[PDB]
Amino acid sequence: GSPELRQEHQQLAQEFQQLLQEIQQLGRELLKGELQGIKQLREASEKARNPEKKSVLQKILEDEEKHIELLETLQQTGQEAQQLLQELQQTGQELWQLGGSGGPELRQKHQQLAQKIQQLLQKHQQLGAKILEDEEKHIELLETILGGSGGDELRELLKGELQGIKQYRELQQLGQKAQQLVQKLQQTGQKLWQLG
Numbered sequence: 386g387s388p389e390l391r392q393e394h395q396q397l398a399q400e401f402q403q404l405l406q407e408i409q410q411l412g413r414e415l416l417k418g419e420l421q422g423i424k425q426l427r428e429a430s431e432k433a434r435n436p437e438k439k440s441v442l443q444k445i446l447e448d449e450e451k452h453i454e455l456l457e458t459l460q461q462t463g464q465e466a467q468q469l470l471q472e473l474q475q476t477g478q479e480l481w482q483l484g485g486s487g488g489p490e491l492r493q494k495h496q497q498l499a500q501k502i503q504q505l506l507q508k509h510q511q512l513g514a515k516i517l518e519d520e521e522k523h524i525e526l527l528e529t530i531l532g533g534s535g536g537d538e539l540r541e542l543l544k545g546e547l548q549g550i551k552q553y554r555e556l557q558q559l560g561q562k563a564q565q566l567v568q569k570l571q572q573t574g575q576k577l578w579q580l581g
């Protein structure tokens with residue numbers, strides 16, 4: 386009944402708020418690591434004398450720089466979702482008291498905030514998927530230049546890129562969980578209105 390559904394909706398929102406925090410914190414860890422890996426790449430690229438290696442490392446570096454902008458956009462998208470979550474909280478606490486009374490604008494605002502957060506999480510997801518694909522492409526490029534012996538510095542770059550992919554995967558994993566929570570928030574909140 387409604388008591389149990391209000392409890393579930395409350396619990397889902399608390400979980401969502403924690404997950405959003407963990408996402409943002411991971412983005413900041415991803416920024417740090419990307420910045421650190423770019424330092425190593427720029428040095429390696431500059432020091433490279435083999436044409437093949439130099440050209441590959443320049444393409445990786447070019448695109449890693451672009452990752453910094455994409456990650457900043459991802460973090461701005463997560464912050465916006467946090468701002469909307471605040472508003473869901475305040476409007477939801479008012480809906481707890483008012484219910485369906487008065488005109489529909491409060492109800493609609495809360496539904497519209499939820500729709501907007503779902504759209505932000507889809508954007509965030511897509512931007513993260515774009516970064517992770519390209520990070521994987523840079524693994525494949527590094528492997529092209531890692532034939533034979535030596536390549537010690539290249540192996541260090543590869544190891545860092547592999548740690549990056551681990552983190553990006555975790556980022557997408559949390560985003561998918563967050564999107565699932567938002568679906569459950571929608572379903573439970575719809576049930577709350579249906580039960581009146």
Ligand code: HEM
Pocket residue numbers: 391392394395398401470473474476477478480481495496498499502567570571572573574575577578
């Ligand atoms: C991202 C999606 C959503 C989030 C984070 C969210 C969050 C919240 C929060 C924090 C509350 C106040 C809980 C409390 O009383 O302490 C609330 C209340 C409520 N929400 Fe949502 N909500 C979401 C989507 C929806 C949708 C789509 C609907 C309806 C279509 C809905 C209907 C309600 C209703 C009826 C209440 C009042 C009952 C209550 O306070 O427990 N919510 N929501």
Ligand SMILES: [Cl-]
Pocket residue numbers: 430431443
């Ligand atoms: Cl260079």
Ligand SMILES: [Cl-]
Pocket residue numbers: 432433434435438
């Ligand atoms: Cl070289």
Ligand SMILES: [Cl-]
Pocket residue numbers: 444448519522523
């Ligand atoms: Cl590439």
Ligand SMILES: [Zn+2]
Pocket residue numbers: 419448449452520549
């Ligand atoms: Zn990257």
Ligand SMILES: [Zn+2]
Pocket residue numbers: 444445448519520522523
């Ligand atoms: Zn690339």
